[PDB]
Write a protein that binds this ligand. Structure first.
Ligand SMILES: CCCCCCCCCCCCCCCCCC(=O)OC[C@H](CO[C@@H]1O[C@H](CO[C@H]2O[C@H](CO)[C@H](O)[C@H](O)[C@H]2O)[C@H](O)[C@H](O)[C@H]1O)OC(=O)CCCCCCCCCCCCCCCCC
Ligand code: CLA
Ligand code: CLA
Ligand code: CLA
Ligand code: CLA
Ligand SMILES: CC(C)=CCC/C(C)=C/CC/C(C)=C/CC/C(C)=C/CC/C(C)=C/CC/C(C)=C/CC/C(C)=C/CC/C(C)=C/CC/C(C)=C/CC1=CC(=O)C(C)=C(C)C1=O
Ligand SMILES: CC(C)=CCC/C(C)=C\CC/C(C)=C\CC/C(C)=C\CC/C(C)=C\CC/C(C)=C\CC/C(C)=C\CC/C(C)=C\CC/C(C)=C\CC1=CC(=O)C(C)=C(C)C1=O
Ligand SMILES: CCCCCCCCCCCCCCCCCC(=O)OC[C@H](CO[C@@H]1O[C@H](CO)[C@H](O)[C@H](O)[C@H]1O)OC(=O)CCCCCCCCCCCCCCCCC
Ligand SMILES: CCCCCCCCCCCCCCCCCC(=O)OC[C@H](CO[C@@H]1O[C@H](CO)[C@H](O)[C@H](O)[C@H]1O)OC(=O)CCCCCCCCCCCCCCCCC
Ligand SMILES: CCCCCCCCCCCCCCCC(=O)OC[C@H](COC1O[C@H](CS(=O)(=O)O)[C@@H](O)[C@H](O)[C@H]1O)OC(=O)CCCCCCCCCCCCCCC
Ligand code: OEC
Ligand SMILES: [Ca+2]
Ligand SMILES: [Cl-]
Ligand SMILES: [Fe+2]
Lengths: 52, 335, 35, 153, 157, 97, 176, 243, 137
């Protein structure tokens, strides 16, 4: 979905059209999200992250 | 070489360039040259465009019978809607010029660059140590091009409904808009004209007050302008005499004496008003139109007593009923 | 025609990289004082 | 003739345009003669009247009514449901005095042609060749002098 | 209307409209059969009520011809008369409509409110980001009368 | 010479009565009980050489034939005009309220 | 009651196509730009004369030094737009000129609409549209919008004319 | 088989089905069993426009042209009875279907040539005595070519046939004899020739395939100018079934 | 210039007998007509089929006659085509189909009578406006 065009037809995120993907996708976000929650708890911005 | 890339970044970002090609500029300069170059060629030699997707080409270029006032670059086909139509999406250019391909190449590059143009209006201010926000004033006119060239089309379902790139083509966008949205009767447009009228008004106020209260340093037969040297220390006009006059025209507390508060107002007014006008077009892009007072006031029996609001509806129906002659096949105009 | 697509794509990548790798290059640094 | 001529919207200074240059003749053409008064009637013999063109309107519709102002005939846009087409009404036109004096015309097209003309008042015969006219109304000196002085002032 | 007129004995498949494109059905740019009229711009619409009529090539002339179900006819009618068109004072319909049906689609309300908010926030972004960059380097309160940066740079003139 | 076949048609029977060979289907809504069912049959059943030939549409129930007989005075018939029949214009000629 | 005045002028005088009305807007629109642009240029090109963030108080009601860097402003625009002021006396006179000249022009255009001496059509366009039915510009399109405005409005907008336009005479596209 | 989504945007939807190199058989005709065409389909490949020999009549030929519109050319869903005739021939008679598509092609000059590529009211026939449909079993016949634009179409100045203006209202006092042709709209109706010559049969499923060539006139624009002669070559696919 | 009981006197049945509504019923109908009709019959027209309107004359030539309280009422219970040769309760709101058109569930015989009265009273007040469309707005 994220690699989908945002123009006519291919509509990107808004083209989601069935609950499996909705539910499925949220499963991924929940994990991917908490994963980053721990990662930041356990870290500091790198170098560029700081010089940027 | 202190390091090529290290150098490159020093040039790009250099504040010693006649024209500040910035980081945003690296995106701006090319997109804007494409938009401009494609436009000029289109406007001069492009052939007729089937704007309404009904195989009824509208020629809008000089070489095909148009003059500066009528001529324009016509919007992509309605057959195309919101689909992306890059040249590499056509069997040929002949096909691309017929479905209004140039339009997209132009609006997209322009809107892209005009944004970076904003990003730049920030960058240079940074490299020069001046406060930001100028770029925020430019967010209003930009937010309009956006509303008129992209939001409205997204909202309406087709780029063919975006404002054409030409004088008369624009009047078309307006006249029809009014018919389908009754914009004159919408709060946001009104705020828009207040800002524009007001702006021009204030622009004249300031302009005159100041120019009229300039300290004499010039001859009777010498341009009053010379009385100013680029890089002066003190002011060139008596802002206390200015306020003295203006305070008496209306009344003291209704007059500015703080040049900073004056200039903030001077910028705040138009920018805020145009912001609303842009939000109007971006809002009526989802069919939340102006007030509809048709047949509101009715008499004791039920008869309809007209108001100017009704005389306005007739003029609107004329537009509705005549625009896009051959494009409709059904009762309701839902597109 | 399939070529032009390729070329255009390349060309836009160049500039977009030049852009990201640009502000990345310690842009805050570039300015009159505090950096 | 002179009298009939003043009763033609083509001499109304209010018709015209800012960049519609030249004499009034580059417009409708050099007036040659008065075709005559046109009287329109419908199958029943009833005499109809052509609603004239108000100066305000660049273009105006052909509508015909009787003495009491009742619409009796007209030239339809959408024929799909026309109730008053000159055809359905047997509209005819007769002339009195002038070029066409004493003549009558009954073939729809010709009747409508003249009806289409009645709109401007008395119907005349123009020479469009000479000045290579375009048939678009231009204003009289009265009009220009007025525009120029109102601006200068 | 394809449904209506078809009941009056019209052959939707071969009906020719004013422009010669196809009153009821036409083709999209890539060949698929879609509804005709200005609605050619929405040929990307998919929906429960309309799908059962779609074939492998888009709207199937046989299903359209004898598989249209009543619940669909009234669904199409319902949705037709509840398009997201309305006025600020909530008068459902086109700007030239008459008062009576007080309605403005929730989809219109939501979409507009959030574009305004979304927008002003982008201004908010620019504004607070512009302030932060000047604040950091430290000049968000004015140019140092003394050390005026511009004054130390060569003239481009 | 050049002529607008339609404006000319309005000078004939069509233009005075419901033309069974040209007039659009909606025209039948101005008489009692002709619209839905019968108008479809009349239009669907090609041209007629004479008004009565309508009474001959295959299947017409005895009552329908009755009704038709009653309204014949409101019908006529003229050469089929393409400009008026092409495009399926007899089922929808682009006119609504 | 003023909006109909606008719609009227479009419909009857095709006022938007008038050279003078255009100048008019170029001035009002362009004047509302100088306004906004100059204001912002000043507020973001100010010297620091206070220790606060709210720089409004930091102003000397009693002249003396320029409160904003006229020299910095010049360089800014000179690098972002290519052109830039550098004579506050002119920059301010310009601001009087632009919108006052604009409104003056928009007036002349109307003084001409009084006599109906409008800028309604382009003759070369009309002539080609007559002979050739496939020639279509955004101009011709507009003129049709006008026809509709006039036909559908005239009745209740000019009561004294007792207009009666039979449904069949009313110009209308397909379906609508 | 592929679902809608499996075709959407590929352009595949504007392509008549195809038979494989194998299917070169023959379908049998009972001559005592009615047959119909469940699905005729025509896909254009080329549009040639015969050029006007200028005044110097020197015999004109057809020339290729670029398709300025897009992949919207195909005719599909054609259907009707394929009655067997006394002499043992077959004549197809169309009833309904997407039997026409407005096409527009450009030329050397840059001229756009719009036509209403169609086969409305087809009446194709074959050779007498045709017990079974073999490869190349020529079908030939005529069809009708209705005006490109229908009765209600209005020109840029509002003039129309069934509706619209009576004249050049922009030139109120101009001579009219010269404008005659462009004010009075005429609705053209003409005949066309086509020939469907088979190449692939498949008696198994009763589905033949092949190539066609048809000729017809282009848009005369409500009779404002002369129509161009057009030739169209492509391929077709038909589904024969007892029914 | 008022809504007199003289104006609220509309035909009850086919045999000429009439009924007189009251300013309460009227308003009430008008409200109900908006609640379950305007959606498609705003101003006496018919959006999903512009060929049939609510003009009294149109209802007069209907089959059976639907230009009186009794008529319209029957219709709101068991709808038919203009020739009456076909029941359409499945794609038109009616009492026998409130499961499909909920808005029609509340509706009681009292309500049906008001809606009907409104339809016969409106054209009496508005006139041509009621039947025609935008042409009359
Ligand atoms: C200065 C101030 C600057 C202001 C800038 C404002 C920019 C706002 C742009 C919105 C971001 C787009 C993101 C998005 O939600 O993107 C999605 C939107 C909507 O995409 C839609 O995607 C599809 C929707 O399908 C859905 O919709 C239905 C059809 O209506 C069907 O039922 C279907 O089943 C259902 O899934 C269709 O193709 C639609 O026609 C449409 O194209 O993108 C679009 O239109 C946008 C078009 C692309 C331009 C965006 C470039 C961004 C950089
Ligand atoms: C881009 C959009 C655009 C823009 C920028 C303009 C801009 C302009 N228009 Mg155009 N217009 C447009 C689109 C646009 N128009 C379109 C699409 C149409 C339809 C065709 C028109 C139709 C139109 C008409 C019909 C007219 C204009 C006029 C004008 C000009 C004058 C407005 C003015 O300053 O009044 C300022 C108002 C005054 C009369 C000044 C005196 C007022 C006093 C000082 C106020 C006293 C206030 C009092 C203290 C307050 C009490 C009030 C109480 C409620 C609180 C201006 C140049 C006008 C013009 O050109 O006239 C010469 C004009 O008549 N326009
Ligand atoms: C929303 C909450 C959130 C926030 C505020 C942050 C914030 C941060 N993250 Mg964390 N992160 C999160 C969630 C979040 N993260 C999650 C859920 C994960 C698990 C996947 C991670 C994994 C993660 C890693 C592995 C790292 C960070 C790092 C960082 C820091 C620098 C990031 C940076 O420089 O980006 C700017 C990045 C660029 C220069 C690339 C621009 C290109 C983008 C991706 C594409 C273009 C965008 C386009 C506009 C969007 C369209 C959609 C697209 C799909 C097509 C920053 C403090 C970095 C760090 O310093 O670690 C301590 C680092 O290495 N994060
Ligand atoms: C300033 C740079 C610039 C930019 C931003 C654009 C932008 C655009 N161009 Mg223009 N163009 C430019 C310069 C530019 N152009 C120039 C100089 C020319 C003349 C040669 C053109 C000629 C041109 C044509 C002829 C056309 C366009 C079109 C377009 C639009 C769509 C193109 C597209 O689909 O991109 C999508 C591209 C991507 C998906 C890539 C984005 C890059 C990502 C972020 C990189 C991913 C990283 C990658 C894996 C890195 C490799 C690994 C690394 C470690 C080495 C787009 C608005 C088209 C148009 O107008 O359509 C409506 C079109 O037809 N352009
Ligand atoms: C006779 C003069 C006249 C006047 C007084 C107005 C007045 C107005 N116009 Mg109109 N207008 C005019 C001529 C006039 N117009 C003409 C000739 C045209 C062209 C045909 C238009 C076209 C037009 C348009 C298109 C629009 C307006 C709008 C408006 C309203 C806001 C305008 C605005 O923000 O201006 C900007 C100027 C200012 C910032 C000045 C503010 C001054 C106001 C009037 C208040 C003054 C205070 C009051 C006197 C009380 C003080 C008392 C206190 C000390 C105790 C305002 C009621 C807008 C509208 O409808 O919105 C509701 C709108 O959209 N006008
Ligand atoms: C292929 C082809 C042929 C293409 C054709 C394309 C096409 C259709 C284009 C046609 C264009 C066209 C003909 C349009 C007609 C418009 C037109 C000419 C209108 C008539 C104008 C006219 C004479 C009427 C009178 C009204 C009038 C005077 C208005 C003029 C408005 C005007 C020029 C204002 C300019 C505003 C502007 C952008 C200037 C900004 C100046 C600037 C950089 C200041 C910034 C700044 C701010 C500070 O605060 C300080 C301190 C400093 C230092 C400083 O610098
Ligand atoms: C006397 C007597 C006998 C008694 C009778 C009193 C009576 C009945 C009279 C009532 C009259 C009446 C109907 C009212 C007239 C209308 C009226 C109140 C006028 C409008 C005034 C008003 C509220 C508008 C003010 C607008 C406003 C905010 C000011 C603009 C300021 C501005 C941006 C200008 C720029 C500027 C300002 C400066 O200040 C200086 C310094 C400089 C440089 C400068 O650029
Ligand atoms: C700011 C304020 C501006 C306000 C303007 C006030 C002007 C008021 C109008 C006065 C009208 C008088 C017009 C006089 C000119 C005239 O009649 O010719 C009008 C001419 C001649 O008119 C001709 O009349 C007939 C021949 O006898 C034929 O019909 C011709 O086809 C043609 O129309 O037409 C034009 O070419 C119009 C172009 C005018 C544009 C001006 C160009 C500027 C030239 C500058 C050169 C200066 C040299 C030093
Ligand atoms: C990125 C780059 C984009 C390129 C932008 C191009 C800018 C246009 C340059 C115009 C020349 C300006 C000039 O001559 O004066 C350049 C002068 C600057 O020079 C002046 O010299 C003195 C005056 O006696 C004073 O010192 C002034 O303050 C100022 O310095 O600018 C002005 O003062 C006037 C301000 C208005 C500028 C014009 C706006 C441009 C709009 C153009 C619209 C036309 C487009 C037509 C389309 C076809
Ligand atoms: C697809 C990719 C295509 C790529 C093409 C190839 C690359 C670029 C080639 C450029 C050749 C043309 C030279 C142009 C010169 C110039 O501008 O002045 C030369 C000056 C002097 O600088 C400078 O010149 C100096 C040398 S000299 O003084 O000229 O000797 C030099 O040392 C210094 O670094 C330099 O900044 O240039 C600058 O100030 C730097 C920035 C340039 C701005 C570019 C133009 C902007 C366009 C904007 C968009 C507008 C839209 C359209 C409207 C009209
Ligand atoms: Mn350009 Ca908005 Mn009136 Mn449907 Mn088309
Ligand atoms: Ca040729
Ligand atoms: Cl239009
Ligand atoms: Fe100032």
């Amino acid at each position: 979905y994220l690699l989908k065009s945002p123009f006519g037809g291919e509509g990107w995120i808004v083209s989601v059209n069935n609950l499996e993907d909705v539910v499925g996708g949220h499963i991924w976000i929940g994990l991917i999200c908490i994963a980053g929650g721990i990662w930041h708890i356990l870290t500091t911005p790198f170098g560029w992250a700081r010089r940027a | 070489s202190a390091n090529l890339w290290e150098r490159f970044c020093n040039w790009v970002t250099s504040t010693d360039n006649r024209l500040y090609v910035g980081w945003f500029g690296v995106i701006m300069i090319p997109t804007l040259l494409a938009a401009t170059i494609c436009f000029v060629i289109a406007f001069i030699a492009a052939p007729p465009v089937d704007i309404d997707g009904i195989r009824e080409p509208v020629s809008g270029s000089l070489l095909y019978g148009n003059n500066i006032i009528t001529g324009a670059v016509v919007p992509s086909s309605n057959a195309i809607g919101l689909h992306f139509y890059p040249i590499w999406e056509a069997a040929s250019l002949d096909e691309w010029l017929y479905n209004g391909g140039p339009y997209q190449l132009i609006i997209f590059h322009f809107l892209l660059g005009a944004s970076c143009y904003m990003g730049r209006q920030w960058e240079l201010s940074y490299r020069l140590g001046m406060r930001p926000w100028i770029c925020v004033a430019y967010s209003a006119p930009l937010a309009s091009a956006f509303a008129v060239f992209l939001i409205y089309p997204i909202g309406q379902g087709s780029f063919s409904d975006g404002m054409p790139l030409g004088i008369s083509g624009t009047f078309n966008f307006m006249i029809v808009f009014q018919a389908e949205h009754n914009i004159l009767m919408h709060p946001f447009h009104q705020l828009g004209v207040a800002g524009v009228f007001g702006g021009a008004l204030f622009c004249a106020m300031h302009g005159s007050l100041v120019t009229s209260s300039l300290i004499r340093e010039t001859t009777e037969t010498e341009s009053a302008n010379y009385g100013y040297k680029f890089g002066q220390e003190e002011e060139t006009y008596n802002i206390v005499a200015a306020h003295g006059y203006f305070g008496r025209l209306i009344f003291q507390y209704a007059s500015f004496n703080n040049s900073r508060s004056l200039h903030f107002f001077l910028a705040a007014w138009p920018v805020v008003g145009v912001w609303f006008t842009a939000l109007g077009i971006s809002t009526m892009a989802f069919n939340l139109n102006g007030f509809n007072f048709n047949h509101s006031v009715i008499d004791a029996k039920g008869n309809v007593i007209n108001t100017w609001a009704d005389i306005i509806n007739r003029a609107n129906l004329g537009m509705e009923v005549m625009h896009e002659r051959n494009a409709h096949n059904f009762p309701l105009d839902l597109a | 025609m399939e070529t032009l697509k390729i070329t255009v794509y390349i060309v836009v990548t160049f500039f977009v990289l030049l852009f990201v790798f640009g502000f990345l290059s310690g842009d805050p640094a570039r300015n009159p004082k505090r950096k | 003739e002179k009298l009939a001529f003043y009763d033609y919207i083509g001499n109304n200074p209010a018709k015209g345009g800012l960049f519609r240059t030249g004499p009034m003749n580059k417009g409708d053409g050099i007036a040659q003669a008065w075709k005559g008064h046109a009287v329109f009637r419908n199958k029943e013999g009833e005499e109809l009247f052509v609603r004239r063109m108000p100066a305000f309107f660049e273009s105006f519709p052909v509508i015909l009514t009787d003495k009491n102002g009742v619409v009796k005939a007209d030239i339809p846009f959408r024929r799909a449901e026309s109730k008053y087409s000159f055809e359905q009404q047997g509209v005819t036109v007769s002339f009195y005095g002038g070029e066409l004096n004493g003549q009558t015309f009954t073939d729809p097209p010709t009747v409508k042609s003249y009806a289409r003309k009645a709109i401007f008042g008395e119907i005349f015969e123009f020479d469009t060749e000479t000045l290579n006219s375009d048939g678009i109304f231009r204003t009289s000196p009265r009009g220009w002098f007025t525009f120029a002085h109102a601006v200068f002032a | 209307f394809l449904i209506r007129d078809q009941k009056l004995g019209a052959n939707v498949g071969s009906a020719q409209g004013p422009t010669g494109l196809g009153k009821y059905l036409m083709r999209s740019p890539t060949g698929e059969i879609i509804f005709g009229g200005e609605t050619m711009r929405f040929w990307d619409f998919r929906g429960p009520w309309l799908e059962p009529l779609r074939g492998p090539n888009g709207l199937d002339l046989n299903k359209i011809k004898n598989d249209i179900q009543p619940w669909q006819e009234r669904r199409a009618a319902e949705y037709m008369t509840h398009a997201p068109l309305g006025s600020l004072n909530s008068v459902g319909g086109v700007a030239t409509e008459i008062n009576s049906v007080n309605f403005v689609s929730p989809r219109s309300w939501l979409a507009t409110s959030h574009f305004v908010l979304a927008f002003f926030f982008l201004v908010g972004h620019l504004w607070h980001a512009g302030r932060a960059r000047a604040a950091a380097a430290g000049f968000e309160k004015g140019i140092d009368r003394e050390s005026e940066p511009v004054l130390s740079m060569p003239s481009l003139d | 010479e050049l002529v607008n076949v339609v404006d000319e048609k309005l000078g004939t029977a069509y233009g005075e009565k419901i033309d069974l060979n040209n007039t659009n289907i909606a025209a039948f809504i101005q008489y009692r009980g002709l619209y839905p069912t019968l108008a479809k049959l009349i239009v669907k059943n090609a041209p007629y050489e004479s008004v009565e030939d309508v009474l001959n549409i295959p299947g017409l129930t005895e009552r329908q034939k009755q009704i038709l007989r009653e309204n014949l005075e409101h019908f006529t018939v003229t050469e089929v005009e393409t400009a008026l029949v092409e495009g399926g214009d007899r089922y929808n000629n682009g006119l609504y309220k | 009651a003023i909006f109909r005045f606008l719609l009227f002028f479009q419909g009857f005088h095709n006022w938007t196509l008038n050279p003078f009305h255009m100048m008019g807007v170029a001035g009002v629109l362009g004047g509302a730009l100088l306004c906004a642009i100059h204001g912002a240029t000043v507020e973001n090109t100010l010297f620091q004369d206070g220790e606060g963030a709210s720089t409004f108080r930091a102003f000397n009601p009693t002249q003396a030094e320029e409160t904003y860097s006229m020299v910095t402003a010049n360089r800014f625009w000179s690098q972002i737009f290519g052109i830039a002021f550098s004579n506050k006396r002119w920059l301010h006179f310009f601001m009087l000129f632009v919108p006052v000249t604009g409104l003056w022009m928009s007036a002349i255009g109307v003084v001409g609409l009084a006599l109906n001496l409008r800028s309604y059509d382009f003759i070369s366009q009309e002539i080609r549209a007559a002979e050739d039915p496939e020639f279509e510009t955004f101009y011709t399109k507009n003129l049709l919008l006008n026809e509709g405005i006039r036909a559908w409005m005239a009745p209740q907008d000019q009561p004294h004319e007792n207009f009666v336009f039979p449904e069949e005479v009313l110009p209308r596209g397909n379906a609508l | 088989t592929l679902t809608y989504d499996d075709i959407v945007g590929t352009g595949l939807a504007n392509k008549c089905p195809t038979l494989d190199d194998t299917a070169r058989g023959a379908y049998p005709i009972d001559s005592s069993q009615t047959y119909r065409i469940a699905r005729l389909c025509l896909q254009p490949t080329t549009f040639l426009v015969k050029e006007e020999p200028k005044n110097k009549r020197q015999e004109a030929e057809f020339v290729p042209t670029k398709l300025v519109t897009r992949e919207t050319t195909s005719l599909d869903q054609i259907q009707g009875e394929l009655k067997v005739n006394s002499d043992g021939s077959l004549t197809f008679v169309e009833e309904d279907g997407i039997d026409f598509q407005p096409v527009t092609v450009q030329m050397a000059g840059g001229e756009r040539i719009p036509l209403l590529f169609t086969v409305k009211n087809l009446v194709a026939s074959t050779q007498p005595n045709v017990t079974s449909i073999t490869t190349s079993t020529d079908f030939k016949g005529e069809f009708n070519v209705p005006s490109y634009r229908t009765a209600n179409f209005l020109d840029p100045k509002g003039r129309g046939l069934a509706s619209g203006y009576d004249s050049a209202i922009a030139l109120p006092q101009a001579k009219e004899e010269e404008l005659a042709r462009a004010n009075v709209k005429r609705f053209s109706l003409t005949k066309g020739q086509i020939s469907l010559n088979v190449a692939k049969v498949d008696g198994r499923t009763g589905e033949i395939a092949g190539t066609f060539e048809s000729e017809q006139l282009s848009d005369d624009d409500m009779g404002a100018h002369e129509p161009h002669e057009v030739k169209i070559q492509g391929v077709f696919y038909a589904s024969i079934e007892p029914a | 210039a008022e809504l007199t009981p003289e104006v609220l006197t509309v035909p009850l049945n086919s045999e000429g007998k009439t009924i007189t509504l009251t300013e309460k019923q009227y308003l009430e109908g008008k409200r109900l007509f908006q609640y379950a009709c305007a959606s498609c019959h705003v101003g006496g027209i018919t959006k999903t089929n512009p060929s049939l309107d609510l003009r009294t004359e149109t209802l007069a030539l209907a089959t059976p006659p639907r230009d009186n309280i009794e008529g319209l009422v029957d219709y709101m219970k068991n709808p038919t085509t203009y020739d009456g040769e076909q029941e359409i309760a499945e794609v038109h709101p009616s009492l026998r189909s409130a499961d499909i058109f909920p808005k029609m569930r509340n509706l009681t015989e009292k309500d049906l009578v008001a809606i009907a009265g409104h339809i016969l009273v409106e054209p009496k007040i508005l006139g041509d406006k009621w039947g025609g469309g935008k042409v009359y707005y």
